[PDB]
Design a protein around this ligand. Sequence first.
Ligand SMILES: [Cl-]
Ligand SMILES: [Cl-]
Ligand SMILES: [Cl-]
Ligand SMILES: [Cl-]
Ligand SMILES: [Cl-]
Lengths: 273, 274, 268, 267, 108
Amino acid sequence: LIKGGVEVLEVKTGVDAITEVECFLNPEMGDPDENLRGFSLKLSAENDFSSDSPERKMLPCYSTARIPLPNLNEDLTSGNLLMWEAVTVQTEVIGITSMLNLHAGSQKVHEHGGGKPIQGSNFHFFAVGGDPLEMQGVLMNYRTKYPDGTITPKNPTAQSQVMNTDHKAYLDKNNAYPVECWVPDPSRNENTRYFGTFTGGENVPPVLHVTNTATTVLLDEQGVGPLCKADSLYVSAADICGLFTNSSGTQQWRGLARYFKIRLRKRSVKNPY
Amino acid sequence: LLIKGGVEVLEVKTGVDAITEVECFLNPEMGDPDENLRGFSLKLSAENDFSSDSPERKMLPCYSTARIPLPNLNEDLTSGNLLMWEAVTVQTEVIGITSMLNLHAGSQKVHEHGGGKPIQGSNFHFFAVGGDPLEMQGVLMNYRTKYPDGTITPKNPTAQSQVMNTDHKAYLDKNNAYPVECWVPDPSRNENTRYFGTFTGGENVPPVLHVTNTATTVLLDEQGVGPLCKADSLYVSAADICGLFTNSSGTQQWRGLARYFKIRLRKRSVKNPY
Amino acid sequence: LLIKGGVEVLEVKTGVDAITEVECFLNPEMGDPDENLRGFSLKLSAENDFSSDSPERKMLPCYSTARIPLPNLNSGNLLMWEAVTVQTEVIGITSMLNLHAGSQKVHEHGGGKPIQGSNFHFFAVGGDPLEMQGVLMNYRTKYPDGTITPKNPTAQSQVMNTDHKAYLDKNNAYPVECWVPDPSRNENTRYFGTFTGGENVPPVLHVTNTATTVLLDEQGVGPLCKADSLYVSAADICGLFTNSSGTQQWRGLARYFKIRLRKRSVKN
Amino acid sequence: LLIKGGVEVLEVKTGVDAITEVECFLNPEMGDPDENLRGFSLKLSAENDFSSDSPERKMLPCYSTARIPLPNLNGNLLMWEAVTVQTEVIGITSMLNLHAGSQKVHEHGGGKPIQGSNFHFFAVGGDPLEMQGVLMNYRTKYPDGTITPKNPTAQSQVMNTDHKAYLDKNNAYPVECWVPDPSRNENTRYFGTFTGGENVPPVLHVTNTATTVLLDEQGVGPLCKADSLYVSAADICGLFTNSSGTQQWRGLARYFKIRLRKRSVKN
Amino acid sequence: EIVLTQSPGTLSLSPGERATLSCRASQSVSSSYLAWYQQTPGQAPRLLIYGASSRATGIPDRFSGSGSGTDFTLTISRLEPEDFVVYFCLQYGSSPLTFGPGTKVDIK
Ligand SMILES: [Cl-]
Ligand SMILES: [Cl-]
Ligand SMILES: [Cl-]
Ligand SMILES: [Cl-]
Ligand SMILES: [Cl-]
């Protein structure tokens, strides 16, 4: 049984064989001033495909964090070594009720009406892995001029609007990889589990569930979860909840933090060295 | 080797009177600005500057909570094993969902000669059952919002309070005080509470509500242990914002409804911690 | 050692004549203001002052109910019929494909507007009348003669007022807008309801003779039919019909029930 | 003592050629007002007086039905027993034609998709489908060539138990007049979904991996009387909108693949 | 009719100070249907508070109302120069609607 270039043995089952790690991962929506953390810059519209230069602060990016884990190995010479194995994840979007604020800055629905709810296109994505998330580049418009501080498909062609296998990246930097340029790569991610739902449309209602009773199993068909290489766990997220509408009709992406609670167990592996 | 709420958990007690049921109707706290419009908020303001956003107290729906006292099971508190009430299941639904079929009272006509406008728009349906008060995390649309006297809202808010600021921790320890728009259940805590919430946002979102006395939610965790009632107290919490009511003028008010709870409890043996 | 409806429950009687089936088509009670538009309410008024809200009787849909007599029982132990399963569906859902009769054109040259908007689909099966809790949009509503509505209502009647308890003991009397099934009671009834509110909500209705709902509780005991009587209750407001004028009327449909019952030994 | 449709049911025959599969493509009956627009109704009239409601024959979609003859079987007598059905709506992708005759969504836009009220229904039985009549308007004057509730009253708009029919003729029973009767159909399995509304999106699934089991609680499927299997359908996908704004029902064919087995019966 | 009395007749305070204005009713005001109005010379009345404690659309948060039955209070938390004008209470719990005689706020 081989998982991530290491031969996998039995689950270690002593007293302290299980641990939980947690993280609140903040969203990277563009943060156009110091007061509008969790929002993008207002959306430009109707750029020519030949002259499409989005502002850095207008582009939501994938969030990621490396969680350091306890050293398990007295030495790295023993016949069998121990690796942390991610078994389950509890995750939800944090602050969903903040969208019940219809008094701050949102366009009235009609004369005498309350503010317009956040609504429109949304993307809810999370990944748990023992390596950085691996991503594939796809563009709406290959001729888009992406701004300084973003990492986007290099030397893009017309093929970059469909599938161009040149566009491979690691989610190896926070607030750098624009959500519109990158998806999780199903051809890779042997040591990562990812889950994403895209809901597109002008007036799409956000639908978000919270519960501390829901658990996602991270074990593969062979009963093996992500194995944490160099005692490191990777969490990744994108939680674009929809568009906020100012009194003018201008629209901004609104994002929310994602909570992760990951259950880990000690897995015996054959020493590769 | 089961530890649940800083106490070692032993076997389920198998007697005749080992099971009990408690029930509560929890009223909604939508703001109730007018003594005749109980269950409604003050009309919604719109288009406040982010720099000058001062919502009226009675415009802000708040979380509801009730502490349910339970019979003391321990004649003695020195015994090697002690007894705690364990919440096993909850039957819950929103009460009065058919009241929204009144389209004659005060709702704007849908068009000339039409009936009144149904309640619709953003809704939130939330309930929790625990052996401790519900633990909450603060998140704000606008960190610069000036919340009014009589609300408990995130203290010393910053720009980070619009995403995740781990300073904003509260117990749901007061009725009609914690605004729904400021607070969510905290998934990093609530070790001894089970919570369930759905937010549906949007201008014209239809309310969808189910009632049945045949549906049960299991409160047991992966280890088969439900919430354990510390100091013989069970906590029930709710927020049921059904949508917006539209007056003939076009003004909008949150409508909320009561939530019923029926909690099945059993006697759980635990190790004496003292 | 099981008490269910103030009676001790014993073993199920077995054999061929231990099972019976009862069935009923329960007509909807939408108001029927006109002898030709059975299944429709009076047109909806709008924009009444909360202080002066006096709805017309025939504008108010009511809960439907029927008492179905069962075969007489009563040897060593007393016997009651125990409801095990119900098969149920809304009857005539395809009648909403009539877009030629009286419905406002969707646009110039277009067909009639489909029935749509707020809907409520509810049924109950019990050995007693359905027990109901009163909740009002407006506690000051002046309900008309021929309706049974919350008595001595207060502001609290718009949220939860535990004074408002009723038995669904009369057909075409209890307005749907005033009453819900009471989850604090109905020990001897199983009820199921879905409310879908909104201006333009599409009706979504399923038919199949392959679906059965189990009426047995956690203890494996179904409703026990006191005085050899089964109670069926329904509300099936499908949505609003729009006339050429823009006036709106509730449209309701009948609900079919087929209940399988078995003989249950009981002791006082 | 197992009785299903006035016949005593014995063991399933466990031979080599004890299983057979039958299939049918059943065409929709939307009205077909001209020979070029097969699968469409006549345009919808609107705002007829309830007292003067005379729909055109070709405006009324009807239930589709066919009798499938089975191989003749006849120690104990044998009947074909329907065990499973695989079924789907055929030509769902034809609705991606937004260039032919559909009203532009806006200036310079593509044609309007088919959308609005839809009904998706199928039945498999060993007898013709049994139906109950219900009317929007009991005073509707139904045209020649339709079979509709006879001697209707105000009660026919709710439940009138007089309105019982067999689906015994193709392109005759209007969908708007008739529903499957849950008080009968002991020897039929039926499944229907109605989705009503102006802008309802058609949502249709195709897969050759999905099977519906036709066996009842006792493990007995429909028993094919007189070596006949009955398939019934209504697949109104929504309304097509012409450039004028006139609307026509669009229907599509339904495929049925029914697995049958030899069942020993008495009488 | 219900008679409303207002106290004081004139309130003399500095900019930045807290103003407390009293309205007393001859009998209980049904549903706490008591409104507060500001009037600047040459203008129509301007609603501050309705239902005793509900702040009207667009009114600054320094204005608040409290009380029930016969005793009602308007509070201006921090007086601005534009606030030194006339204030009237209105009861609409009983027909006919009746106003108090007013309170003038002057710069000390
Ligand atoms: Cl690249
Ligand atoms: Cl805080
Ligand atoms: Cl009452
Ligand atoms: Cl007939
Ligand atoms: Cl302003």
